[PDB]
Each structure stands twice: as C-alpha cells, then as structure tokens.
Amino acid sequence: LLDLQKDMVVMLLSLLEGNVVNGMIARQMVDMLVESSSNVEMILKFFDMIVGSEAFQDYVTDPRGLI
Amino acid sequence: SVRALQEMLANGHRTLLYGHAILLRHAHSRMYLSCLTTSRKLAFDVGLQEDATGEAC
C-alpha cells in the first residue's frame, strides 16, 4: 500500500512538471487537497514516525529496548 | 457511501457523490426526512422523523 501511496503522487508530480505559476492544472492539485483537507491531514501526520528514538533513552529498561 | 452508512448505524462540507446515501433534514421543524412506515396502495408514505437514527432517514 505504501508502495502504491508513492506511485499515486508520482503521477501527480509528473502531472506538475509543466506548470506555470497559477496553472489550471496546478491549483486543482491544491483544490483537491482542501476538499480532502481533513483527509489528507491524516496521511501526513502518519509521518510523525528512529524519530521517536530519543524518548526510549529517557526511560530505557534493558538496552535491547523494552518500555 | 452506502456501506459507509452501514457502520455508524452499527455503532467538512464534503461534496455529494452520486450513489452515496444522504441524510435529509428539514429547514423548520428540523426533523430528518424519512420513509414513514405507513400507507395510503402498497408503498409507504414519506414523511419527517424526529431522529437521525434508523436507516429510513
């Protein structure tokens, strides 16, 4: 699914290669992201996730990991 | 979505899509519109209902 999550936005970035600044094909890319704003809000906050690694160090138990 | 419906019932100004189920609601009394289980000579009468709940709405 993540393999496909890439491919979907790839066609999109290949849909943006030819843009002017306020391109009709461009701001429609933004236009969907406001129509899906709450929806797109979720895909990207999924990328909160190493990253959190330092917090394990704050209360590490037994070096392998575990908390 | 029609089976998106079939989950919250077992529990953003999005654009209407064709083939979606939608919850109608009166401007005044603010009863939701529904298929009342009544007749006037087989098929049921339409009318408002007090609750958003329960399929017919």
Buried b (16+ CB within 10 A) or exposed e, A5-28: eeeeeeeeeeeeeeeeeeeeeeee
CA B25 – CA B43 distance, rounded (Å): 22
Residue B34: name the closest of B51, B48, B50 by CA.
B48
Question: Which residue(s) pair with B44 in the sheet?
Answer: none
HEC string of A27-59 equals HHHHHHHHHCHHHHHHHHHHHHCCCCHHHHHHC
Q: What single DSSP character describes residue A62?
A: B
* Cβ proximity of B34 and B46 under 8 Å: yes
Q: What single DSSP character describes residue B16?
A: P
Residue B48, both tokens: 């408002």
Rounded to 10 deg, the angle between the A37-45 and A24-35 helix axes is 80
C-alpha gyration radius of chain A:
19
CA B29 – CA B5 distance, rounded (Å): 24
Please tell me what resolution, in angstroms, this structure has: 3.8
Residue B54: name the closest of B3, B5, B1, B2 by CA.
B5
CA angle A2, A8, A14 (to 5 degrees): 135
Taking CA atoms, what residue in B is nearest to A39?
A: B12
- A contacts of B12 (beta carbons < 8 Å): 37-38
Residue B51: name the closest of A16, B29, B41 by CA.
B29
Is A37–B15 a contact, with Cβ atoms under 8 angstroms apart?
no
